[PDB]
Each structure stands twice: as structure tokens, then as C-alpha cells.
Amino acid sequence: GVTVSYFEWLNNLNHVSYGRLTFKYERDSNYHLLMSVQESLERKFGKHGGTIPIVPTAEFQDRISGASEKDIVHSGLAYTMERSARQIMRTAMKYNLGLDLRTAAYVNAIEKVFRVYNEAGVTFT
Amino acid sequence: DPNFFKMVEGFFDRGASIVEDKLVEDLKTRETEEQKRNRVRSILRIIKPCNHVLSLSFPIRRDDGSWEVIEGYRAQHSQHRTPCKGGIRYSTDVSVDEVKALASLMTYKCAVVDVPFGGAKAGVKINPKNYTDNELEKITRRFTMELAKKGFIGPGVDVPAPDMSTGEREMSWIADTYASTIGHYDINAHACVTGKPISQGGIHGRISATGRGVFHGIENFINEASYMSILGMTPGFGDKTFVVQGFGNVGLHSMRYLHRFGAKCITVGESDGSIWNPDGIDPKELEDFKLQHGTILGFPKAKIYEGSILEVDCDILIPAASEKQLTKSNAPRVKAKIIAEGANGPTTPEADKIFLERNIMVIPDLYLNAGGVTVSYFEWLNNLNHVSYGRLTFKYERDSNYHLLMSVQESLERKFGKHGGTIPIVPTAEFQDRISGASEKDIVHSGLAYTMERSARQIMRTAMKYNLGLDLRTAAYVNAIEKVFRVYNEAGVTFT
Amino acid sequence: DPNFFKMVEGFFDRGASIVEDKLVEDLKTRETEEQKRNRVRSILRIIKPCNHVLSLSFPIRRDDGSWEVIEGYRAQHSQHRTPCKGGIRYSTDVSVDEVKALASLMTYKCAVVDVPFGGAKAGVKINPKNYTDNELEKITRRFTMELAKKGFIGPGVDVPAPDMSTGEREMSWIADTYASTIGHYDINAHACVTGKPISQGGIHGRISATGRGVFHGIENFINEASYMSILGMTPGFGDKTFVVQG
Amino acid sequence: DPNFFKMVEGFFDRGASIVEDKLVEDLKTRETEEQKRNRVRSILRIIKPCNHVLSLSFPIRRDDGSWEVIEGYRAQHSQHRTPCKGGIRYSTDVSVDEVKALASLMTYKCAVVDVPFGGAKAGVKINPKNYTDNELEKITRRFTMELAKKGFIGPGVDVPAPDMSTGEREMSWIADTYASTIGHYDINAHACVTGKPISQGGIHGRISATGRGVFHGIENFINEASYMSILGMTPGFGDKTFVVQG
Ligand SMILES: NC(=O)C1=CN([C@@H]2O[C@H](COP(=O)(O)OP(=O)(O)OC[C@H]3O[C@@H](n4cnc5c(N)ncnc54)[C@H](O)[C@@H]3O)[C@@H](O)[C@H]2O)C=CC1
Ligand SMILES: NC(=O)C1=CN([C@@H]2O[C@H](COP(=O)(O)OP(=O)(O)OC[C@H]3O[C@@H](n4cnc5c(N)ncnc54)[C@H](O)[C@@H]3O)[C@@H](O)[C@H]2O)C=CC1
Ligand SMILES: NC(=O)C1=CN([C@@H]2O[C@H](COP(=O)(O)OP(=O)(O)OC[C@H]3O[C@@H](n4cnc5c(N)ncnc54)[C@H](O)[C@@H]3O)[C@@H](O)[C@H]2O)C=CC1
Ligand SMILES: NC(=O)C1=CN([C@@H]2O[C@H](COP(=O)(O)OP(=O)(O)OC[C@H]3O[C@@H](n4cnc5c(N)ncnc54)[C@H](O)[C@@H]3O)[C@@H](O)[C@H]2O)C=CC1
């Protein structure tokens, strides 16, 4: 809930919900890709006259018709919580910490908070 | 022909006598069954009047060295969501009673389409016909200084917009005056007005905003299987005629999109004539014939018809004319099964009752006419992100499409590929005309068709949750009130 | 080998003697055929000079307790689209004539690529070779305070950038000085300079920016079927050699 | 007949070669006898140059619909005591070299009479003879907007004053322009310029200010018993003639 609290702060700071300007645009681009695969096949197998009905799945349809802001949030979260684990796994090797993860958690934090004081000139003198 | 300010306030009082009951029940608090009544009736008295109204006076100096006193107005209806958006009108008949009305009308108009900022309106008692082009910018530049010093213009307070007698060149003069006196240290300075020309922040495809709106307004209802059966026709614009009154801004830009999708235009009338053709009229040539003349009297490919165009055979009639146009005069004489409104108050409350008695599905103006309010919200964001739409994504999303096709090609040629036959997966001639010309204009005409659709499904719904049948206008106001209510209730209106 | 400030201004005057004619015709207004001429020639006199030019003077205290006077400049060419963007140069030969030039040059450079903000430029008469790393941050941190108090730095006014003798570590010192004295109550505080290191807002793939630029610059022309036939070669980088100076 | 900017700076360098010695001795600190020398010589290099100098450019629209470019200057010499006060001059021969001079001259003029604010000066290359009364207020009203947005006018920053070719009616136009655009929420708005007419804040007995000054200037010396004996006369204006040029 810290991550989503960061997404709410941006929602309130862009003055628009997520995806309002893009859902119906990205919807049309999907159907033009399918209609492109259909046409392209029926130029090779098409003399046989067999139609090839390329259509979305019953799940990918349940993803288009109900595409809301809620999806982008539950996505940007699953991307944070993953890009961040790979950095704890890594640090747990660069220092040979084995299966001590808690220490590797704090070691990432300190090592990133350090790179901000160092390259800033902490003192204003 | 009733007074107007009574009409608007007449709907609110009517639409609050409906929602009041289903709204007490859905409250959560420790109160009596009667303390809630005193809570609902009470908030509904706070939403009704207009919070702020101003009134000005200008020392303008005419071109001949004279002086005179200009006199303006601006009313902000609600503050529940900031800023407030509302046009500026130049007319010698801009009272303070009609500014309060139109302000309240936008707070509900921009609520049925889920556009955040609330409602406002301004007016100036002049006649732009009687002024030079240097007298106008004197009046406009000062009307902003004497209005931003009292906190009625700003990227987060009010955002004026164009209106009658007020084109783009009046939005340029407001923005430069603001951006260089008082909003100088403000990064969002140029987001104080919408409708500006393209060269200074304006969006593309703005003059066709109410046009595209009126189109997508009816498409969401023509496809609705339920409301069609009652009217007696089939979904889709196939085999559907229509007619157009007032051929101009809202009319021309709406004939096109309808005519492009099957709907056969039939008659197009104006304030100074009308045209009749049971065979179908081509909008382009109809425009072209006026692009050099100024009137449509005597079009080649369609004969003459004079009198009332509202009393004409049709299937979808649109009144692009002015208010108070269709009443008990001819309410049993329309012959059409749909009346989609295009302007403010085309219909008197009398004809509304007759239309319920005649299986006519009148579509409210609060919804359809939404249109250029939505794009005015997109321009405000364009000016507030400091970048056009999609600049950072068009070429990125272009490559991702070609890698999908090249993926389908490879994957097939691993199964059928031993036969050696190549499989040229390539875009269509239309989907190519969509990649090479992908601009900002596409995103706007998309985010609009998504607003105008997500919003209809909410009016259809409310028209069932209260069993309103084919009364849509009431369902429009009922959605607005029911959403504006959920903001005062969960906020603690009083600061005490 | 001509003077430089003459070269730039030489192009503008030349390029305005061309557009002037095709530009009168595409005007819409109620004027004569000669009142328009007096309108075009006139705006083209307003775009040419530089609106604002500043000039500073610093009491810096050397490491050995001494004092000396640093001397800077900053010129904002146009205000037609805000903010203004322009690098900062440290060099003992930064006149006020070359700052006006390079400022005007960016207002047109960032117009052919449709980047909104206008042009600016700054300079400081020092030689970074002759200063420690604590003398530099003294010069840089104060050059911003004596420049933001007069409204020449800010997320919506000016956005300095790196240039010769000015790397990233000079963009860190400007941002922290601004973000903690005068832009404290400002949500966009750290948007006052670009070129910062990655750890403090900088973008990825910035040192290869002019690189990628130079590449895509020529690719759009090599593929142009018309301009190639005249030169006498075929489209595409196939069979095409090239050479590189510097 | 020597150059002027050399004269002023010539006095300062001369008058600092005198005070420098009696000034080291009256310092209190833990330093050498030579670290003090490096402290006095050093501050005297900081007082000498002019901190800030600006330079502008105006799009004014003449009465006949034409356009032209006005070109101004303003130099604030010192910041040691704020605001800064300095007149505005309209003349076709207002260089940037003479604005630096006269600015420095006031920082010392208003120090011998213990008036707190420091020195400044402005100029505009026009000839008021060649302009109507609506062209002047166009030039004056905009010269303030393009000068207060960069923090060079204000009740606590700079306070312009009249000068040659600049009467009261030019101080009215500055005050109203400031008090209604940028100093609107400021209680001290109308304290941004002096010399205004009486009906808008001006003091009484202002046109006779340098007059009364010149009088009391000599009276304090005529009565001084010492300096008179050397000259060879008696105190008091009794039996004393005088003459007046200009
Ligand atoms: N469940 C329901 O009955 C409704 C749900 N929604 C949902 O809202 C989401 C996105 O809607 P947005 O408004 O775009 O996003 P948002 O997340 O920014 O919406 C904030 C809330 O304020 C309401 N709202 C919007 N504009 C308003 C205005 N001017 N005055 C008063 N209330 C206003 C919206 O309906 C929404 O509930 C979707 O999840 C959509 O389904 C919208 C309407 C009805
Ligand atoms: N343009 C816009 O973005 C919006 C316009 N509106 C409203 O739409 C109405 C008009 O649309 P506009 O966009 O202004 O287009 P317009 O200004 O181009 O409309 C004028 C048209 O109406 C016709 N007309 C006028 N009075 C008539 C009468 N009594 N009978 C028959 N025809 C008549 C004219 O001949 C002409 O074709 C107005 O009520 C306006 O406030 C409402 C919201 C947005
Ligand atoms: N039709 C034509 O000749 C041109 C059309 N365009 C169009 O502009 C759209 C997007 O361009 P953007 O600038 O990204 O979007 P925008 O919508 O934000 O552009 C605003 C307008 O200002 C101009 N502009 C941009 N940066 C400028 C600068 N620094 N100084 C002065 N003018 C500047 C643009 O060309 C554009 O007309 C597209 O529709 C593109 O085709 C751009 C250039 C020429
Ligand atoms: N003992 C001495 O040698 C002197 C003593 N004074 C005394 O100062 C008192 C009142 O003087 P005010 O200045 O009216 O009062 P104040 O109390 O406000 O003076 C503050 C100090 O700053 C100095 N000062 C004034 N204007 C200045 C300017 N523009 N730049 C730099 N320094 C400036 C003054 O001489 C004074 O020492 C009296 O007690 C008077 O005798 C003034 C001059 C010399």
C-alpha cells in the first residue's frame, strides 16, 4: 500500500484518471492487428475460399470490455514488486549473504540512500 | 415559450423530488429515519443556488479619445471540484439572471460526462459589431486584469472558454494578459483558457468537437437493443434517414460523420430556407455550394421546401437552431421516432409530456451537446503536461506492432515452413493509413468516443433503477444530482 | 574566418529576405497591401534582438582566505514560449557578444524540432583548471542565488543545462541550491536544471543524445529518393562509407 | 575634458589609497599583520564594481501602427542596504558605461548623508521630443512590467525617481502600472517610486529640495570658525556677495 499510495498521488497530480485517453485507442489497434493476420493468411490460403475467423479469446475479451483504471494499478504494482525483488536477490549475492534476506533488504536501502547524499554535496556551505 | 431561468431550476427541483427517496436509504450513519431526511433535503438546498457572482465596471477609452463604461458578470456555480470552466459571451442582453442559469447548467453538464471541474459563466454587455479590433482587445485585456485580481481566472480557479461572438482571437488576448501580469511565476500560466489557436497550445480537431459528440451520442442508443424495439426499428444506421436544422457549426460537422456511416441525410434547413430530397444529399457539395454564396437557397441536387422543417418526415431529427423551438404547436406533427437535441433547451416542458405520450425517445441536450466540453478538458491537460499527446509513444508503439507481425510470420513458418512457402504478414491498407498518419488528432477523437459511450451506459442504467421508461432528460439530471451529492456528503460541507 | 556573431545574425537577415514575401500573402486582416508590409517587416525586427541580458559580480572567498570578483552573464533571447533553456559555460573568454549570439541560436534550434521552450545562454569568466573542487561549488552555488533572486532560474522561467567545462556535478550543485533556498514551497523544484546525474532525476541515455541525433539526422535524407538521385547514389547505408573528425 | 566614468572610479581608487592604512589598525580579529592587509584590499575590490546590470528590448507600437524596438538599461550598484534608489533618464546617449558610473555615484552620495538605501540608475535610448504623449506612456508603462518581473522595481528592491526629461507625469505612470499588475496584494504598493505628484502621495516642497540643500550646504561651513580664518573672511552671510550660473 505504499506503492498504490504513490499512484494515488500521481492520479491527483495529473488531474485525470489512468488510461481515459488510451483505452479505446488501444482497443482499435488490437482489432486492426487481428484483421491484419486474417487478411494476410487469406492471401495465401484464401484461394481455397476458407474464411479464417481470427477473434479474441473469451478471457482477452473479458479484459477489453472491462478495461478500467483498476487494471493499470494492479499492473504497475506487480511490476514494482518484481523489479525490486531482483535487486534483493542480487545484493544477497554481491555480499554473500546466503538466505539472510532481511539484511539484504536494508543493504539495498542504505546503498541507494547513500548515492543521493554523496552526489549532492550534503553541506550547503 | 416560458422563461428560461425557470426551466433549468425547474428540472433540478423535479429531479430532486425523485432521487430524494432512493438516496435516504443508501446512507450510512447513526441517525434516525427522520434526521436523514433533514440531511438529504438540506444538501439539496446547498447544491441549488450559485455560490459566487461578480459584477464589474470598466473605464475603456474609445478610439476617438472618448470614455465609456463596460459592464460585466461572472458566476461560479459550484466549488465541489476545482477549477470551474465556463465560456464568455459578448451580447447586449447578458443579464445577471441568465448568467446564474447557464452556470448551474454546466455543473450538471460536465457531471454526466465525468469531467472534473465545475461550472461557471461570464458575460459582457457590448455588441462586438460596434467596435474596432483595437477596442475589443482593450475590452478583453482589461476584463481579465479586473477579474484575475479578485481570483476569478487561473489554471486552478477558473478556466474561461469561447462562446457566441467570442472566437479564438479572444482567447489569445486573455492568455497573454494573464501569463504576463499575474501568472508570471506560474509554470501552468498558459493553462488559464481553452479554445486558444493551435499555435499557442490549442488542440487539434476542436471545431468538430460538438460534431463528433452529436454523432457518438446517438450511436450508443441506436445500438441499444431494448430502447429500439419500443421505438419500432432495428439497430445500426442501416436504412436510417435523418434531417438537420441549422446548418452551421454543430450541423455541418455532424452531417459528415453520420453520412459517412450509412445514415442517409434527407433535408437540411436553415433560418432562411430549407431543402428537401428523399434521395439523399451530399454534405461536402452542400457545404461547397455555400462556401461561396452564404445561403443554401437553390441547391442543385435537391429541391426547395419552405416553412417548418420540424414538421417534416424523418427518422432522426436534430434541432441545431436556438432555444424554445419545439412545443405544443406541432408536438403531434414530427413523424420521427428520435429527437436528438443539439442546442440549449430545444424543447419546452410541454412537448416533453406529449413526446412521452407518443413513443418518441427525445435525447437530452445535457448529454449530447457535451461534446466540446470534453475536448476543452483535453486541451487543459495538454497545456498542463507541457507536451502533446503521444509524442513519446507513437514510434515506440509502431515498432511493437511490426514485431508482433514478424512473430506471427516466424511462428507459422516453423510449422508450414518446411514447405518453403513464405507467408507475408503485412498491415492492411487501412491500418497503414492509421500508422503513417498517427497524430494527436487521433487520441482526441478516441478519448471523446470513450467518454460519450461510458456516459450513455450510466444514463441507460439510471433510466431503469428508477423505472423512467423513455424519459431520458430526467435520467440525465438524476445522474448529475446523484453524483454531485456524493461529493458534498462525503466531505463535511461545513468547515465548522 | 569571419566573426561569429555576424554569421548568425547574417543568416537571420538573409532568411527573412526570403520568407517576407510568401508571408504577406498568407495574412488575414483588413489592411492595405502596404500596411501588411509594415506589419511583417516590423515583427521581424522584434524577433531579431535579445530581450533580456544580465551581468553579475560575485564576492567569492578563495581557499586561502583571499577574495576575488567573479563576473557572469545570462541572456534570454525570446519569451514567446516559456521557459527558456540554455547551457552554462565556464571560460575566460565568455564575452557578452557571444552570449547574445548563442542564445539567439537556440531559439531557432529548438524550433526546427518543435521543442517548446525558447532560447537562453549563460557564461562565467573563470578557468575551471585554476580552481579546487570547493572553490567551484562556491562559485556555482552563489551564481544561482544571485540569479534566481532576479528571476532567471526556475522550473517555469529558465532551465540551465550543461556545456563545455560544465559536467553533471555542476548541475547537482545548482539544483540543491535552488531547491532549498527559494524553490522550497514549489512542487516542481527539482525541474530547474537538466543534465543532472541519474541518481537525482537525470534520464537514461543522455550522453549518447547528440550521437543518436547525428545518426537519425542523415538517415531521413539518405532514404529520400529525390535528393539522392541528384547526388548520384542509392538510398540506404548499404555500400556507403563515411569518415569522422574529432 | 576627460572621460567621466574614469573620473568617478578615479576618486574611489584615490580615496581608498588613503583610508586603507588607518583602517587596518582599527580591525579586531585573530590574524597576522598581513592577513588584515589581504582583508582590507579585498573588501575594497568588492565595493568597487557594480553588482547587477540589466539590458532590455521593447516591442512598442507607434501611433501610426508601426513597430519599433526601445532599448533600456538599469544598474544596481550595491546591495549592502536595501532598497536601491536611482533616477530614470530618457536620452539618445544613455550608454551602459554611464549608467554604471552614475549608479556607483549614488551609493556614495546617499552615504555621506546617512540615507539608508543604496544606489541605482536607469536609462532609455529615446528622445522624448520625438514622441506623442500616448507613445510615452506606452514606453513607460511597459518599461516597468519588463523590469518588475525580473525584480528591479518594488517598495523593497528598487525605487525609481525622476531625472532629466522625466517629470512627475512619468512617475504617475510607473506607480499605477506597478500597483495594479504585480504589487496588487502588497500594502506598500504605492511606495515603489518617489517624485509622484502631490495628489498621489508626493510630498510638499520637493522642487525646492536641491535648492534648500545648496543653501544649508554652505551655511555649515561659513559658520565654521577654522576654515574661514584660512580663507580670510568672517563667519555669517553678512557682507558676503555671491553669483549664480545656470
Ligand atoms: N459504479 C458506478 O456506478 C460508476 C462507476 N464509475 C467509475 O469511475 C471510474 C473512472 O471514472 P472517472 O470519473 O473517469 O475517474 P476517477 O477515478 O477520477 O473518478 C472519481 C469519482 O468522481 C466521479 N466524478 C467524475 N467527475 C465528476 C464531476 N464533475 N462531479 C462529481 N463527481 C464526478 C466519478 O464517477 C468517480 O466515481 C471507473 O471505474 C468507472 O466505472 C463512473 C460512474 C459510475
Ligand atoms: N459551437 C459549439 O461548440 C456549441 C454550440 N452550442 C449551441 O448550438 C447552437 C447553434 O450551434 P452553433 O455551434 O452555434 O452553430 P452555428 O453558429 O454555425 O449555427 C447557426 C445555424 O443555425 C441556423 N439558425 C438560426 N436560427 C434559426 C431558426 N430560428 N431556424 C432555423 N435555423 C436557424 C443558421 O441559419 C445556421 O445554420 C447555439 O444554441 C449554441 O449556443 C452549444 C454548445 C456548443
Ligand atoms: N501542417 C504543418 O505544416 C505542420 C504541422 N505540425 C503538426 O503539429 C502537431 C504536433 O506538433 P507539436 O509541436 O508536437 O504539437 P503541439 O500541438 O503542442 O504544437 C503547437 C504548435 O506550435 C508549433 N511549435 C512547436 N514548438 C514550437 C517552438 N519552440 N516555437 C514556435 N512554434 C512551435 C508546432 O509546429 C505546432 O503547430 C502535428 O499535428 C504536426 O503535424 C507541425 C509542424 C508543421
Ligand atoms: N560616531 C560617529 O562617528 C558617527 C555617529 N553617527 C550616529 O548615528 C546615529 C544616527 O545616525 P543614522 O544613520 O541616522 O541612524 P541609524 O541608527 O539608523 O544608523 C545606522 C548606522 O549606519 C550608518 N549609515 C547610515 N546610512 C548608511 C548608508 N546608506 N550606508 C552605510 N552606512 C549607513 C550610520 O552612520 C550609523 O552608524 C547618531 O547616533 C549619530 O551620531 C553617525 C555618523 C558617524
Curated annotation (Swiss-Prot), chain A:
Modified residues (N6-succinyllysine): 24, 44, 47, 70, 94, 112
Residues of the full protein shown: 434 to 558 of 558
Binding residue positions for ADP: 17, 83
Known role: Mitochondrial glutamate dehydrogenase that converts L-glutamate into alpha-ketoglutarate. Plays a key role in glutamine anaplerosis by producing alpha-ketoglutarate, an important intermediate in the tricarboxylic acid cycle. Plays a role in insulin homeostasis. May be involved in learning and memory reactions by increasing the turnover of the excitatory neurotransmitter glutamate.
Positions bearing N6-malonyllysine: 24, 70, 94
Location within or outside the cell: Mitochondrion; Endoplasmic reticulum
Protein name: Glutamate dehydrogenase 1, mitochondrial
The species this protein was found in: Bos taurus (Bovine)
SS bond list: none
Residues where N6-acetyllysine is found: 24, 44, 47, 70, 94, 112
Protein residues bound to substrate: 5
PTM: ADP-ribosylated by SIRT4, leading to inactivate glutamate dehydrogenase activity. Stoichiometry shows that ADP-ribosylation occurs in one subunit per catalytically active homohexamer.
GO molecular function, one term: identical protein binding
Similarity comment: family membership: Belongs to the Glu/Leu/Phe/Val dehydrogenases family.
Gene: GLUD1
Phosphotyrosine PTM positions: 79
